[PDB]
Amino acid sequence: AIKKYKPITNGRRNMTSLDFAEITKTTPEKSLLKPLPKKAGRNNQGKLTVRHHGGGHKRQYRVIDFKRNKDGINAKVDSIQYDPNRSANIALVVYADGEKRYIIAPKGLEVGQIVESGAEADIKVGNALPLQNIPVGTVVHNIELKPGKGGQIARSAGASAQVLGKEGKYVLIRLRSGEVRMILSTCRATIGQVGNLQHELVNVGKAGRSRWKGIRPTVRGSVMNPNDHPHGGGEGRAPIGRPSPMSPWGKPTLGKKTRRGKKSSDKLIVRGRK
Amino acid sequence: VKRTYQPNKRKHSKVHGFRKRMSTKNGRKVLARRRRKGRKVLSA
RNA sequence: UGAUAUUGAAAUUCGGCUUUCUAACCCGCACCACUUAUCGUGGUGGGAGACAGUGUCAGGCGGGCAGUUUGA
RNA sequence: UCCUAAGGUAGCGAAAUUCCUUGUCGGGUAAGUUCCGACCCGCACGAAAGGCGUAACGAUUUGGGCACUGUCUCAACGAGA
RNA sequence: UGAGUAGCGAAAGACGGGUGAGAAUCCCGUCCACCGAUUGACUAAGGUUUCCAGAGGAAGGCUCGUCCGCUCUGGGUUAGUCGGGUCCUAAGCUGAGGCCGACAGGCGUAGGCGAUGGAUAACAGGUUGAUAUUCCUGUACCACCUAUAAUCGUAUCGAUGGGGGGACGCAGUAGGAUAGGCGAAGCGUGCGAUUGGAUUGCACGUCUAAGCAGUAAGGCUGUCCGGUAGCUGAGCUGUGAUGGGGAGAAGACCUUCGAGUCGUUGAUUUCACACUGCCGAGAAAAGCCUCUAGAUAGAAAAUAGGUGCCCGUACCGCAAACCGACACAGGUAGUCAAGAUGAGAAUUCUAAGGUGAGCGAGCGAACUCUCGUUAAGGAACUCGGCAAAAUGACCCCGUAACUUCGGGAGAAGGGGUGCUCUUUAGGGUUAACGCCCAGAAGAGCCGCAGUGAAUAGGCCCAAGCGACUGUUUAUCAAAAACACAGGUCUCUGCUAAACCGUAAGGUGAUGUAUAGGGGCUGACGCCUGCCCAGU
RNA sequence: CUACCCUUGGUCAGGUUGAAGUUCAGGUAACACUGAAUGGAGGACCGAACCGACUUACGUUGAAAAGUGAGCGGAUGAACU
C-alpha cells in the first residue's frame, strides 16, 4: 500500500506517496464542518512566537467526538474518510437513533460497534469502555485522563498502549514512548490500535511538497550574525566554540532536562520513557 | 522606478483622521498642541 | 532550594523525620442556572489537599541583558 | 628507550590547503611559472564545522580544439546625431 | 565673472489659400510619412473644474505665437432598475457586564462595525457648444397603497427556533452552440485611361430586453419537515416585440418622400467545476424553500388607477491633468483584441481610429557616439576570443562514451526547399452539385542566390565546486554563499516542552511521542576508526 | 516604500515530450512476462505577455539621486499580482 514513483525528473526521483486504498468516500459530511483559519504561529498581539509556520493549503475542521458516551446504542460504520487535520483516518458512524458523528478509525474496522458501558458488550475493536472492565494485557488507544473530558493519549497514526495490573483506584498503563504511569479507573478507553501504519514510511521528495503543508525553511544558527544567535559568526566556517550548544534564546539544548510542567503528577509517573 | 507615496482617501482618513485621534489618550494630546499653537487644520 | 505567614485535625516513631483523614486553598474536570453564548459568577458531583499557588527574608546558578576599565 | 588520557585507521594528496617551489618524471605547444596523468619528501589532508566517488543540472570557475570573423598585422571609405 | 559659452528632453514634413501691427510655429485644403496585442476604444484608483463658448497676449510655454491644460467674463454633471446605503457576512477592529494591572491602561463574552466575496427589477434608438442604461420617443419589469370582481372561512400568517439548500480546490481532453472572419453575384451608384480589356472595377448584404413555445448536453430515479433499519435545472433556436427603428444610396430641393436584408464554408482564449483523473482535501452568513410553536379570518386568478427617497455622474485616466520639485525616455489593476502571412496575442505591411512630438536654417572639417562594407592573412589582439561575425525555421537520414535506465539528444554529421502544367485512391460538410483543409509521382522554365525580405541553438574533448528547481546584499559583489528532500542527536505524558506579556490572556494545537521545539549535517552510492585526563 | 503573514479576487498567445493505470492479443496450476491501443502525469522541454537583472556599450554639472539600447534567465509553480 505504498505508491512509488519513477525517476522521470529530478525531485520526483526519490519520492514516495501513499496508496489511499482504505478510503471509501471522498466527499465529506456537510453537517460536521467548521472553518479553521490559519494563524502562522502569531500571537494574539500579532507577533510571531513559533517559527517555521506559514502558508499551506486551505483546510476545514471536522468535528470528532472523543467522549464516546452513549447508553447502549448500536452504530454501523459507513465509510472511512480522509482528514487533513490528523495523521489517522476517521469513520462516520450512524446510531440507531439516526445520529451521525466522526470517530477515529482503528486498524481493520468496518463492522458495527457499540458505545458500551460496563459489561454491555464484548471486547472488540472500536468499543469505548472504562479502564476497570478491561483485562490485563489488552492494548488500547484514545484513553481519557480526567473523567468526561475526552480521549487525549494515543491518538496519532499507529499509536496504542496496553493495560498492566490494577491497584484498586488506579490502573497501570505503558505508553507508546515507554513511560509508565497511573490512570484513574473511571476513564474511558477504546479497544484496539489505530490504523494508517504506513504513514511514517512516506518520503516527501522535493521542497515544494513540504511547503504546502504549512512549513517554512529553517536557517542554521551557525550562518547567522553574532547579534542573532549565540552560535554567532566568525571568519569562514567555525565550530561551536562554546562549551555547549545553545538555543537561539541562550539556553543549553543538548541533554539538559526541562521537566517543570506539572508537579502534582510526579506521584503517578512510575518509570520514565524508554 | 516606483515612488514611496501612493495616495489613498481611505488610508489617509483611517490613520490620521479626527476620530482616530479622539479614540486614544495620546492622540487627544496632539489636537491640544495644535490648538495651543493656532493651526488652521487640526487632523489631516 | 530552605525558614516563616496563609494553615487544620489524628495516629507511628527518636520538638521533628512519616502515614492517613477533611474543612481551608486549587481544578484551560463534567452537570444545572442566569443566558437567544460559557468569558465570568453562583450551585450540585468527582480529583487533589494542608502540598501546590502567593507575600516577606536567606544561599546558589546566571554574557540572556546592562554600566564601565584595558598605563606611559 | 623516554611519554601521555589515546597517540591519525579506511581513504585522499605540490590540492578553493605545499612556505622551500616554476618540486621531479610523463602528456599536450615550433616555444607552457598556468592545465591534465602519476610520484609522496602531507611546513600545516582526514572521516556528519563529515572522508572518498558519482549520471542529470549551471547567465558558476579553469585548460585545449573546430568553424568564424576589423580583435589584430594596418587601417581605408560611406550614412545619421 | 566664466559667456553671448553648454543646453533648448527619443521621431517627417512640404506647399497653396486665409487671419492679423507682426506667422517655419494659429486656422482651412491637398499630398506625404508614423503606430495599429496599439501612439485606437471603454473603466478602477488618484487628481479636483484642468470640461464648453465668446474675448485677451503682461507673466508661465526651454524659440515664436494672433494659439493654449495660462488670463478675464458667463455656462455645463438630471436614475425605482447602472455602482454604494435603508440587505448578509472573511480577516481585522471595537466591546455592556466581566478578568488583570503603580497610574495611564491591557485582555476579552454576548452584541456590533467592516468587501476585494454572496444576494438584487431595463433594454434598443434619437438628440446638444459641454450630460446620457439618467433627458425625449417605443415596448417592458419590480416592491408597495387603495378602490371593485372569481372564490370564501381550518381558508390565512408564522418566527430571531428545527432542517434542506446557498456552498466553493487543481489539472486534462472530448462535444453542442454562438459572436466575429472569409469567398459567390442579392442592392446601390460608376463604366474610363497612357498600350490591349467591357466576362468592368468599388461599396452594402441590419434590428436588443421582457414573454410565448421547444432545446445539444448534465444530474437523478421513490413538527406531517430532516435523519435510522418523471423530478428539477440548461446554453441556443423559432414566432411575435417590428405596418416601427437603423441603412450603402438616389429623385426633386427636426422639409416631402420611397430602396435589397439570401444561402455556402470554416470557427473561438466567450457560453457548463459540467464530466473523468489526482492529493496538497478545497470560508461564512443572509435572501430563497419547508416543518411545527405561536397568530383563531384572504385573495398568491384578474380589472382600474396611484406611489417609489439619500450619495456619485463634468473632464484626464500607459498620461502635458495620477505618483516622480518640471508640459520629466521612468512607474500605474482590469476589459474590448480586424485583414493578408503563420502553431500562434511571434514577424513584416495595413484597417477602424489616431498622430506628425513646442527651436529652426546652412555646411557636409578634426574629434566622440549609433550604423554598413572591406583585398591578402585568420586570435599573431588581450589579464581573458571581452565585443562583433557565424549557427537559426519546417519535412527526411543518422547518432558515441557514460548512466541512478529516466537520460545523454535538437548529441555530433548530412540532404531537401521557387514557379508552370499534366496524371491522381484519399480528411470533413451537404441528396447531389459546391466549399474548406491535404498527399503521392512525372514532364519543364528561370536566376550569381529559391524558409531569395523581417522573425528563430554555435559545437566538441577534459577538470574543480555545489546533487537538482529555487533564494540573497532595493542603489559597485548572483557566487563554491543560504534553502532544500534525506540522516542523526537531544528535550516534551498534556494546564506538554518552547516562545510573547515574563500579569490576565494567547501561539504551539481546536494537535497528543508515526506528535511538537531546538543543535548539527546536507539527494544517491560505499563508509564513518582511536581517547572520558580536562570542560 | 520595503520584509514576512492573514482574508478575499484576478492573470499565464502557441507548440513538444508521452509516467502510473486501464483495455486488449499472446503467455502460464496460478501469480503475471510480452505486444498493441488508450491514458494525459511532471518544482518536465521550446517559446510571447508578465516578472527578473547575467554580459557589454552609452549616460555620469545625465532625459532619470539607479536609466536607455543590444543580447540574457524563469515562464503550471517554493509562480506573478
CATH number for the domain that contains residue B30: 1.10.287.3980
Count helices and strands in chain A by DSSP H and E runs: 1, 17
Among candidate residues A82, A103, A170, A92, the one with its CA nearest the CA of residue A131: A170
DSSP code of residue A61: E
Using a 10 angstrom Cβ sphere, with 0-12 exposed, 13-18 middle and 19 or more buried, the burial of residue A128 is buried
In contact, A129 and A137? CB cutoff 8 Å = no
Phi and psi at A42, nearest 5°, equal -110, 140
Answer for A146: CB within 7 Å of strand C: yes
The spacing between the Cα labelled CA in A259 and the C1' in E491, in angstroms, equals: 9
Phi and psi at A209, nearest 5°, equal -75, -35
- The set of cell numbers assigned to A48 is 510571531
b/e per residue A19-52 (b: at least 16 CB within 10 A): eeebeeeeebeeebeeeeeeeeeeeeeeeeeeee
The spacing between the Cα labelled CA in A80 and the C1' in E195, in angstroms, equals: 93
Domain residues for the domain of B21 are 1-44
Euclidean distance between the first and the last CA atom of chain B, given in angstroms as a whole number: 28
**Rounded to whole angstroms, how far apart are CA atoms A189 and A131?**
6
Domain with CATH 4.10.950.10 in chain A: 195-270
Q: Name A101's Cβ contacts closer than 8 Å, sequence gap at least 6.
A: A32, A63, A64, A65, A92, A93
**Long-range CB contact pairs, A56-59, < 8 A, 24+:** A56/A211, A56/A212, A56/A213, A56/A214, A56/A215, A57/A84, A57/A212, A57/A213, A59/A84, A59/A85
**Long-range CB contact pairs, A35-44, < 8 A, 24+:** A35/A60, A35/A61, A36/A60, A36/A61, A36/A85, A38/A214
C-alpha distances (whole Å) from B30 to each of A36, A54, B10, B24 are: 41, 38, 21, 10
Answer for A265: CB within 7 Å of strand E: yes
Euclidean distance between the first and the last CA atom of chain A, given in angstroms as a whole number: 30
CATH of A2-113, one of 2.40.50.140, 3.40.190.10, 3.40.50.300, 2.40.37.20: 2.40.50.140
b/e per residue A220-236 (b: at least 16 CB within 10 A): ebeeeeeeebbbbeeee
**Rounded to whole angstroms, how far apart are CA atoms A160 and A82?**
20
The spacing between the Cα labelled CA in A211 and the C1' in E37, in angstroms, equals: 37
Q: Is A52 annotated as a binding residue?
A: yes
Half-sphere exposure of A40 (CA within 13 A, CB side): 12
The spacing between the Cα labelled CA in A30 and the C1' in E141, in angstroms, equals: 38
DSSP code of residue A49: -
Solved by what technique?
A: cryo-EM
Resolution of this entry, Å: 3.1
**The residue to which cell 541562550 is assigned:** A250
In contact, A194 and A104? CB cutoff 8 Å = yes
Find which nucleotide's C1' atom is closest to A7's CA: E406
How many structural domains comprise chain B? 1
Strands (E), chain A: 2-4, 16-18, 34-35, 60-61, 73-81, 90-95, 100-104, 113-115, 128-130, 139-141, 143-144, 151-153, 161-166, 170-174, 180-184, 188-191, 269-271
Find which nucleotide's C1' atom is closest to A205's CA: E485
Residue A13 backbone zone (phi > 0: left; psi -120 to 50: alpha; other: beta):
alpha
**The residue to which cell 468499543 is assigned:** A127
Q: Which three-class secondary structure state does DSSP give residue B35?
A: helix
Half-sphere exposure of B44 (CA within 13 A, CB side): 5
**Rounded to whole angstroms, how far apart are CA atoms A218 and A54?**
12
Find which nucleotide's C1' atom is closest to A3's CA: F20
Domain with CATH 2.40.50.140 in chain A: 2-113
Using a 10 angstrom Cβ sphere, with 0-12 exposed, 13-18 middle and 19 or more buried, the burial of residue A272 is exposed
Q: Under CATH, what is the fold of the domain A195-270?
A: Ribosomal protein L2; domain 3 (4.10.950)
